[PDB]
């Protein structure tokens, strides 16, 4: 018998494969987000706390989605962000605002309780070491080094005195002198932090963004690329993609008339086909930016995600943001 | 609330993303399978039923894999098969040889108790319907029709009297006349059954090889391609890949000389880099079919799979077949 494991990096690998499957240039895939269902779920749908039934993963579910479909929009690479959980140093809204463990990924310079450098965006660090005092996950072990050696996890008893600042050593090492050791990872520009990071997630730049513009992400001093080729997403174990997609009513004016009832569904379909003159004609992949559902081969493509929701009213010359989370 | 789900098709999508990612380019992946560790696990290492310890998913574990690494072999697309569980109609060696549920995927024409067409390969079908008499997974429901209406699963009390034969309706529907209704899916060529299938899995052809030669897979009558572009893997919810990689002693003569110690580890690394003359030199992805650890940038690429196994001693003119399963 064998002892095999898929590493955490395979999750990142899967996420990156999906992201790289789309785009410009060669033989790449095309993915669409769809919206539909004007017909009310029931007389309830408008009252507070209403929740529609879950979508059904079946042939019938896909068919019903197409029947209610009102529009489709091409998903661009730019609408996809790799994200990881957000942990702000010193945020007293949540537990352990000043206490961390080795490998924790923390944010600084994102708020007053965190400010370290005007003129820099949010600064992200990884905890390399903690104070010798504390306890182990495997209770019996009272020595930090022994705890870690045996695969235990060490919770320090002494808090981080000040937020890590700067980029640190040539290797990015930072020693505040409070027993904690930190490693500088990267910087998040304001356009990203303001518009794409949330209370729960921070964006980690894709490898191509890092090769293209390292200073934008305060990564010009990084040396780890000599081995990891800008795979910051792997280093921080990013495995979730967050969509910042937009449904612009200017391309579907009949779906945003004054007084409309709104839409209730969203779906993602990979590689749908354009409509045909005769069903036996050649398959042509849908590559245009948007399609009235009538202009696509009904039920073509593969529906990988489905979502039912209370009704949202689209307004002309206005856009609606759709956010989706894919975990790999 | 916003009730969203990822469909079973998303699993097939990730598997396919992975398969199609292999190649040359910045938006593609080169994949290598490594082998190593001649040092014994321990003295019982040879005893029957011996199980080595599990590899460790950490930087130290990657460091150790590289330390013990003996060689690396480039993985080619031809070494990857999409598979689904094999359920042979009437095979009494396993449970429920004659009882099926809607959507079960069954294999016929594989044995005497399964024969339906001399000259043809194994024939794959999907159960569309089952007898009215039976039991619902939701006890308080007597009717079969109702059971399924509430997301239940119906287990018929009457068994299948005979396996389906032929390709069925214009849409592949078959009715043996025993209360079971089947749908013809595809045919597996004889060479594939012998060389790529196992007692546990059967291969499902990839979209491009199927579109390229439908007759090979008894798919020439198919019409669903008018919507699914030959996406059979999605139709049958295929989500695991089986590797068929070969380690030929010719490539590593020294590693396999008489009186061998053998190899005990296998790992899979994506996009490793070749060695550099200077640390600061540009990154060069490895693309040759073979490499000795020494010729790659140590710890380069991302290790997505690690496996420990009992020693296997290679020798003069011998080839070890390595089989791996990735479930997406
Ligand atoms: Cl883009
Ligand atoms: Cl604290
Ligand atoms: Cl934005
Ligand atoms: Cl990238
Ligand atoms: Cl059409
Ligand atoms: Cl979110
Ligand atoms: Cl793909
Ligand atoms: Cl090949
Ligand atoms: Cl049975
Ligand atoms: Cl073979
Ligand atoms: Cl067999
Ligand atoms: Cl393919
Ligand atoms: Cl292929
Ligand atoms: Cl090197
Ligand atoms: Cl196997």
UniProtKB/Swiss-Prot annotation, chains A, B:
Keyword Disulfide bond listed: yes
Keyword terms: Disulfide bond, Viral baseplate protein, Viral release from host cell, Viral tail assembly, Viral tail protein, Virion
Gene3D superfamilies in the cross-refs: baseplate structural protein gp8, domain 1, baseplate structural protein gp8, domain 2
Gene Ontology cellular-component annotations: virus tail, baseplate
GO biological process: viral tail assembly
Coiled-coil intervals, chain numbering: none
UniProt-annotated location(s): Virion
The UniProt record lists the keyword Disulfide bond: yes
Covalent S-S links between cysteines: 136-147
InterPro entries assigned to the protein according to its UniProt record, in alphabetical order: Gp8_sf (IPR036327), Phage_T4_Gp8 (IPR015298)
Induction line: Expressed in the late phase of the viral replicative cycle.
Matches recorded under Pfam families: Phage-Gp8 (PF09215)
Family that this chain belongs to: Belongs to the tevenvirinae baseplate structural protein gp8 family.
Function: Intermediate baseplate protein. Involved in the tail assembly.
Binding partners and assembly: Homodimer. Interacts with gp7. Part of the baseplate macromolecular complex which consists of gp5, gp5.4, gp27 (central spike complex); gp6, gp25, gp53 (inner baseplate); gp7, gp8 (intermediate baseplate); gp9, gp10, gp11, gp12 (peripheral); gp48 and gp54 (proximal region of the tail tube).
Name the record gives this protein: Baseplate wedge protein gp8
Organism: Enterobacteria phage T4
């Amino acid at each position: 018998i064998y002892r095999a494991i898929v590493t955490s990096k395979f999750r990142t690998e899967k996420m990156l494969n999906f992201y790289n499957s789309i785009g410009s240039g060669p033989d790449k895939n095309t993915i669409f987000i769809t919206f539909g269902r004007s017909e009310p779920w029931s007389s309830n749908e408008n009252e507070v706390g209403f929740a529609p039934p879950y979508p059904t993963d079946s042939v019938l579910g896909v068919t019903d989605m197409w029947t209610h479909m009102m529009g489709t929009v091409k998903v661009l690479p730019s609408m996809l962000d790799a994200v990881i959980p957000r942990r702000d140093w010193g945020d007293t809204r949540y537990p352990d605002p000043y206490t961390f463990r080795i490998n924790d990924i923390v944010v600084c310079n994102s708020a007053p309780y965190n400010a370290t450098e005007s003129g820099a965006g949010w600064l992200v660090y990884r905890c390399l070491d903690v104070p010798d005092t504390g306890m182990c996950s495997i209770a019996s072990l009272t020595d930090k080094d022994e705890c870690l050696k045996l695969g235990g996890k060490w919770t320090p008893s002494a808090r981080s005195m000040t937020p890590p600042e700067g980029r640190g050593d040539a290797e990015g090492t930072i020693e505040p002198g409070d027993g904690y050791v930190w490693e500088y990872l990267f910087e998040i520009p304001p356009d990203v932090s303001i518009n794409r990071c949330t209370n729960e997630y921070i964006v980690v730049p894709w490898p191509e963004e890092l090769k293209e513009d390292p200073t934008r992400w305060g990564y010009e001093d990084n040396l780890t690329w000599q081995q990891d080729d800008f795979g910051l997403i792997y280093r921080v174990k990013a495995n979730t993609i967050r969509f910042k997609a937009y449904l612009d009513s200017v391309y579907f004016p009949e779906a945003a008339l004054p007084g409309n009832k709104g839409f209730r569904q969203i779906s993602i379909i990979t590689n749908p086909l354009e409509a045909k003159a005769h069903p036996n004609d050649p398959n042509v992949k849908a590559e245009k930016d948007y399609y009235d559902p009538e202009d696509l081969m009904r039920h073509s493509g593969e529906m990988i995600y489905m979502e039912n929701r209370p009704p949202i009213i689209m307004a002309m010359d206005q856009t609606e943001e759709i956010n989706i989370l894919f975990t790999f």
